[PDB]
Amino acid sequence: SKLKYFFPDSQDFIDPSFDFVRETRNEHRVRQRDDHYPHEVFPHPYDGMLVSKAVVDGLGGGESKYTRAQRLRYFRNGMKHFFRLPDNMQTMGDCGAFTYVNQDVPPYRVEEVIEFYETSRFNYGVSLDHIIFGYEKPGESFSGEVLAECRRRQDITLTLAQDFLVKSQKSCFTPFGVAHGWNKKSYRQSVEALLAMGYKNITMGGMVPLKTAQILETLEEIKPLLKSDTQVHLLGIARPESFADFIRLGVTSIDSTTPLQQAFKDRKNNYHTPEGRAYTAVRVPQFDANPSLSRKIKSGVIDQDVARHLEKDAMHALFEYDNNALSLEKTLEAVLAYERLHSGEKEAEKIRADYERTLGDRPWRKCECNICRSIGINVIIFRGAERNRRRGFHNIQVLYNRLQYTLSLRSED
Numbered sequence: 001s002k003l004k005y006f007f008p009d010s011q012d013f014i015d016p017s018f019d020f021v022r023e024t025r026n027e028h029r030v031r032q033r034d035d036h037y038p039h040e041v042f043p044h045p046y047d048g049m050l051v052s053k054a055v056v057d058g059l060g061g062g063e064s065k066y067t068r069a070q071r072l073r074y075f076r077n078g079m080k081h082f083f084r085l086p087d088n089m090q091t092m093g094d095c096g097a098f099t100y101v102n103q104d105v106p107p108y109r110v111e112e113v114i115e116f117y118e119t120s121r122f123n124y125g126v127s128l129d130h131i132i133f134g135y136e137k138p139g140e141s142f143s144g145e146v147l148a149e150c151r152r153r154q155d156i157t158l159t160l161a162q163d164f165l166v167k168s169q170k171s172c173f174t175p176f177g178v179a180h181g182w183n184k185k186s187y188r189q190s191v192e193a194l195l196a197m198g199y200k201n202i203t204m205g206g207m208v209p210l211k212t213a214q215i216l217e218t219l220e221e222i223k224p225l226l227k228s229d230t231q232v233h234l235l236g237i238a239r240p241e242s243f244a245d246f247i248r249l250g251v252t253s254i255d256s257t258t259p260l261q262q263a264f265k266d267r268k269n270n271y272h273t274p275e276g277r278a279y280t281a282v283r284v285p286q287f288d289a290n291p292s293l294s295r296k297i298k299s300g301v302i303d304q305d306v307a308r309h310l311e312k313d314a315m316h317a318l319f320e321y322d323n324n325a326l327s328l329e330k331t332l333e334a335v336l337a338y339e340r341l342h343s344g345e346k347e348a349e350k351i352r353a354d355y356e357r358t359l360g361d362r363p364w365r366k367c368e369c370n371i372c373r374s375i376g377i378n379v380i381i382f383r384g385a386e387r388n389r390r391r392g393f394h395n396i397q398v399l400y401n402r403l404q405y406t407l408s409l410r411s412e413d
């Protein structure tokens with residue numbers, strides 16, 4: 001209750017037909033319909049999902065996004081059936097402001113958005129915002145065309161936040177007002193305004209790019225305005241060492257994919273732990289998806305065969321090591337033989353220590369989650385999307401376990 005965690009949908013599902021040894025799948029399986037979200041792999045890894053209108057409408061994300069078939073199925077069957085959401089979970093609707101950040105005004109009318117939230121049957125709907133990227137550095141003061149723009153987008157958000165509260169008066173979702181700002185004081189302004197209109201429920205927007213200190217100073221500035229009944233939501237944020245601090249400062253709700261993004265986007269610390277100490281995933285790339293190796297082949301540096309064999313030997317060693325049938329010593333040698341090649345020799349010696357730690361500590365054996373216990377050493381291999389996203393899923397469950405731990409603490413004396 002005291003702090004809910006919502007998982008933002010960015011088509012992050014896994015293919016349960018993936019053969020980890022052979023690296024084939026069932027080619028006749030349909031994307032999304034036949035795939036698993038985290039809540040289909042774990043009992044309860046979040047309290048709900050957050051669905052963006054811009055993402056569902058395909059135009060936004062810039063990517064392997066919602067197809068027209070997926071989109072029709074969404075509305076045809078309802079978004080509960082689409083996501084296979086259990087009844088103990090909840091849903092929050094969003095517009096996907098990040099998708100139209102560089103446009104003049106938001107491209108949707110308020111009436112459309114309410115249409116979407118009503119037909120999706122979401123528990124919570126977030127007002128149609130326009131993001132204010134940028135926040136004043138220490139002893140920086142925005143002026144001129146920069147300040148006029150910030151103030152313009154603040155006015156557009158609050159204009160629309162008020163339209164949205166009014167036009168959504170007979171809807172079944174609880175409405176959430178979006179607060180943007182370029183400093184602590186502009187954020188406070190936005191929040192005062194929204195509460196004044198009659199919002200009980202606030203979304204602090206545009207906070208993802210900020211350091212934690214900047215977030216915590218803004219919240220300590222907003223805390224006086226908050227009431228017994230006021231809900232506060234941090235769009236995009238999940239920084240688990242700061243949970244206790246957010247609860248102090250009146251936050252009731254967070255949402256983020258960054259634990260999942262972190263599994264494959266970071267160089268070090270791909271595999272999180274509840275200790276909070278983390279492990280580097282071991283790079284073993286597909287020889288014919290790697291840019292670095294495409295070029296080495298093309299340039300005549302290695303025969304294609306020997307590449308393919310060094311790749312195999314590293315994958316084989318890893319598997320042997322996890323059946324306790326190969327020394328850590330010799331496992332490293334196979335893996336580093338391949339690293340020598342897709343990253344160069346000196347880079348191999350750099351990452352040796354990090355690898356000794358990951359492989360030696362066997363941290364995937366420690367973790368009780370269903371990914372680690374089902375795919376083993378594969379969770380700590382950085383290869384294709386199938387391993388990377390499963391590691392992501394592990395990170396999601398780890399974050400939610402950290403959150404439940406914090407919620408378990410009651411002050412007394």
Ligand SMILES: [Zn+2]
Pocket residue numbers: 367368369370371372373394
């Ligand atoms: Zn795990």
